[PDB]
Amino acid sequence: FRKMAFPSGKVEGCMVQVTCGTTTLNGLWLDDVVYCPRHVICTSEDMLNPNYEDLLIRKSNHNFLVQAGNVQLRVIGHSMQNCVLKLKVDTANPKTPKYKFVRIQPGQTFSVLACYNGSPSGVYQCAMRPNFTIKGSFLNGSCGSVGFNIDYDCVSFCYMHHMELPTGVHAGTDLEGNFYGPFVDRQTAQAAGTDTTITVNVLAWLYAAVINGDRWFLNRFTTTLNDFNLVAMKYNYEPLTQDHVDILGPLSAQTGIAVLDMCASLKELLQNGMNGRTILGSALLEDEFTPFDVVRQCSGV
Amino acid sequence: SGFRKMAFPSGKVEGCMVQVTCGTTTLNGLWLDDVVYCPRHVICTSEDMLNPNYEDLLIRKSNHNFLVQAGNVQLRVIGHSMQNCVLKLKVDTANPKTPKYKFVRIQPGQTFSVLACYNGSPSGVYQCAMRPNFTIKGSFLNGSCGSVGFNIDYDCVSFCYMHHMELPTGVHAGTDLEGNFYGPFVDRQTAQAAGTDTTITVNVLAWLYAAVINGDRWFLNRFTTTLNDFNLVAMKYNYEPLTQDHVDILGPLSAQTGIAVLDMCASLKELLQNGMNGRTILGSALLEDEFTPFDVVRQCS
Ligand SMILES: *[C@@H](O)[C@H](C[C@@H]1CCNC1=O)NC(=O)[C@H](CC(C)C)NC(=O)OC[C@@H]1CCC(=O)N1Cc1ccc2c(c1)OC(F)(F)O2
Numbered sequence: 001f002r003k004m005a006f007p008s009g010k011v012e013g014c015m016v017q018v019t020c021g022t023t024t025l026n027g028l029w030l031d032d033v034v035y036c037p038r039h040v041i042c043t044s045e046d047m048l049n050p051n052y053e054d055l056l057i058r059k060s061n062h063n064f065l066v067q068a069g070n071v072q073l074r075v076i077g078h079s080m081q082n083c084v085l086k087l088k089v090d091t092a093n094p095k096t097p098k099y100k101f102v103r104i105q106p107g108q109t110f111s112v113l114a115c116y117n118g119s120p121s122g123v124y125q126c127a128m129r130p131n132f133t134i135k136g137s138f139l140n141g142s143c144g145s146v147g148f149n150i151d152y153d154c155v156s157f158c159y160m161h162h163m164e165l166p167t168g169v170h171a172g173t174d175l176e177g178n179f180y181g182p183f184v185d186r187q188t189a190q191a192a193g194t195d196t197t198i199t200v201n202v203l204a205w206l207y208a209a210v211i212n213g214d215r216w217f218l219n220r221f222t223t224t225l226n227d228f229n230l231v232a233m234k235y236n237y238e239p240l241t242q243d244h245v246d247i248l249g250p251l252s253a254q255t256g257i258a259v260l261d262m263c264a265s266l267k268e269l270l271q272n273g274m275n276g277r278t279i280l281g282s283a284l285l286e287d288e289f290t291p292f293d294v295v296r297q298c299s300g301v
Numbered sequence: 302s303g304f305r306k307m308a309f310p311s312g313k314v315e316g317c318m319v320q321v322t323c324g325t326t327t328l329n330g331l332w333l334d335d336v337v338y339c340p341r342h343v344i345c346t347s348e349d350m351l352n353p354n355y356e357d358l359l360i361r362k363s364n365h366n367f368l369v370q371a372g373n374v375q376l377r378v379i380g381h382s383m384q385n386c387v388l389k390l391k392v393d394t395a396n397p398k399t400p401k402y403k404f405v406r407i408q409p410g411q412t413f414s415v416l417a418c419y420n421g422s423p424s425g426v427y428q429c430a431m432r433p434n435f436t437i438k439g440s441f442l443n444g445s446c447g448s449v450g451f452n453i454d455y456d457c458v459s460f461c462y463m464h465h466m467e468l469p470t471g472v473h474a475g476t477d478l479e480g481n482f483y484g485p486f487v488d489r490q491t492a493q494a495a496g497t498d499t500t501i502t503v504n505v506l507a508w509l510y511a512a513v514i515n516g517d518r519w520f521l522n523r524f525t526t527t528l529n530d531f532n533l534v535a536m537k538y539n540y541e542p543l544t545q546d547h548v549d550i551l552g553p554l555s556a557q558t559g560i561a562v563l564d565m566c567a568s569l570k571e572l573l574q575n576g577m578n579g580r581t582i583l584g585s586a587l588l589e590d591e592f593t594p595f596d597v598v599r600q601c602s
């Protein structure tokens with residue numbers, strides 16, 4: 001059972017390089033518009049406390065160099081929507097997929113296409129943490145890399161990358177330019193709120209470990225939803241809602257394990273530990289698979 | 302901690318996937334220039350899979366018995382031949398999305414990305430390591446055969462794996478793109494068993510180098526060993542012996558850290574013989590063996 005990213009080709013065809021001054025990062029080119037982080041317009045000194053509206057009015061279209069491979073695209077207009085800069089260019093991207101912009105919920109997963117200088121570098125699956133960070137792999141020059149999900153042939157973009165926090169986690173916006181979380185695109189040290197574990201996802205992953213014939217963790221005990229949630233919250237796990245229980249049905253039916261029976265198993269693991277043993281390889285409980293993720297990977301989408 | 306299994310962007314390979322059908326048996330093929338490569342067992346009915354005679358099955362076949370499709374568009378077959386366990390179908394159209402490519406045969410311990418495909422359609426991409434027993438731990442469902450594993454160096458796709466089967470323990474086996482199986486497996490629907498697996502020592506050493514790069518270096522000792530002494534001890538812990546090629550591919554990390562490979566070997570030996578003693582490395586009490594030296598450099602630097 002594998003953490004699996006969406007095929008990235010439809011997104012690769014949209015990545016371009018955007019430069020302003022000595023600053024270079026990635027942009028996303030959809031039809032005749034290039035989307036990128038607005039802090040591209042900032043110098044070193046600008047980044048410590050940037051008045052973006054002020055810095056933006058002092059720029060011309062010709063301050064922005066956009067490159068699709070070897071080809072420069074001419075910027076014929078620019079505007080700003082929250083923390084994203086939109087650069088209108090004179091050519092349409094014929095590789096534009098069917099797409100939508102979505103804001104994802106904490107606990108949901110998406111694929112990241114990490115890019116440098118407009119060139120795709122790697123792809124991997126991430127979850128929006130409850131504290132609205134993401135545990136990504138992003139180096140200098142990764143900004144403007146995007147996160148996405150694919151449904152049929154439609155790409156739903158949900159994340160654009162802007163920053164790293166001192167703990168090594170990452171923060172960014174949706175494609176409307178609104179940050180996930182209480183962060184700001186200024187070069188200052190920013191801490192996140194206390195993170196919590198995505199309980200419905202841990203439960204999905206336990207079911208997966210069962211489906212792959214691993215069940216040392218199961219038990220005869222059982223629990224009410226509320227008593228589970230009391231213990232969950234004590235251990236900085238998110239509460240489990242009835243809709244979460246509903247979502248887990250399919251995995252429940254599949255294995256013949258009632259959701260609340262699996263909650264009892266997870267409660268025992270929280271309280272006792274893994275006593276050295278491991279599940280699907282991991283010394284640690286995994287919380288970045290949604291129920292959909294586990295199912296779709298026992299379906300074949 | 303802070304390391305992710307990261308796959309290569311899959312777009313260049315997505316542009317090469319097709320489906321190949323013989324009667325009702327459909328699997329995936331790889332379309333490069335005017336040849337489609339696929340597992341030869343596409344020519345087998347279930348009765349043939351039980352104990353197939355491939356050369357006889359192939360002589361009964363003509364070009365017009367092979368249905369090759371890119372999406373729903375038929376690609377006409379104008380020639381067919383068998384190379385080891387792969388079928389080569391000459392087609393009348395050169396794939397306009399053919400990337401720069403080569404066919405490489407990887408060594409155990411090397412990692413690659415798998416683009417899991419069904420009916421010629423990509424479902425997901427993920428990183429795999431070739432185990433020392435020549436199996437991989439994939440996520441492969443019915444209809445996945447002919448999915449390929451690859452690395453991308455610059456813009457050149459090195460195809461190293463094509464999927465053919467599952468083993469009784471639920472791990473996976475297949476061939477290179479010349480059709481030669483990795484490991485002592487054959488494409489027949491008979492129960493086969495993989496060698497007992499071992500830990501990929503070269504990758505563990507890469508992981509220790511990664512830890513040192515990130516400032517986690519308690520396990521470094523003042524000592525060294527010969528390669529032979531290390532190998533004899535390591536085999537007692539179900540670790541793979543190192544090869545000269547392993548020593549060579551650790552060169553860049555050795556140089557980056559100034560820690561000679563054989564000194565790191567001595568550090569590892571001490572971890573094996575004395576244990577971790579309740580310590581963590583990179584956040585874990587488990588040594589990771591599915592990140593190659595290349596993987597470490599790509600995520601550190
Ligand atoms: C893309 O332009 C780039 C992406 C970064 C670079 C390294 N990894 C990334 O993800 N963005 C930025 O550099 C971003 C630009 C601002 C104008 C928004 N700055 C940034 O991340 O600066 C440091 C960061 C801002 C928020 C915060 O708390 N810090 C301070 C900090 C201090 C020490 C750190 C650290 C961040 O990350 C660390 F590496 F772990 O150590």
Ligand SMILES: *[C@@H](O)[C@H](C[C@@H]1CCNC1=O)NC(=O)[C@H](CC(C)C)NC(=O)OC[C@@H]1CCC(=O)N1Cc1ccc2c(c1)OC(F)(F)O2
Nearest residue numbers: 342441442443446465466467468469471488489491492493
């Ligand atoms: C692609 O055509 C397909 C891929 C399979 C489908 C399920 N997972 C896969 O990887 N290949 C085959 O079905 C393949 C075709 C033959 C011509 C090789 N056969 C196959 O995998 O047959 C079963 C397998 C062959 C070697 C072996 O020992 N077996 C028997 C077996 C028994 C019990 C199993 C098992 C395999 O896998 C298990 F799920 F773990 O349980």
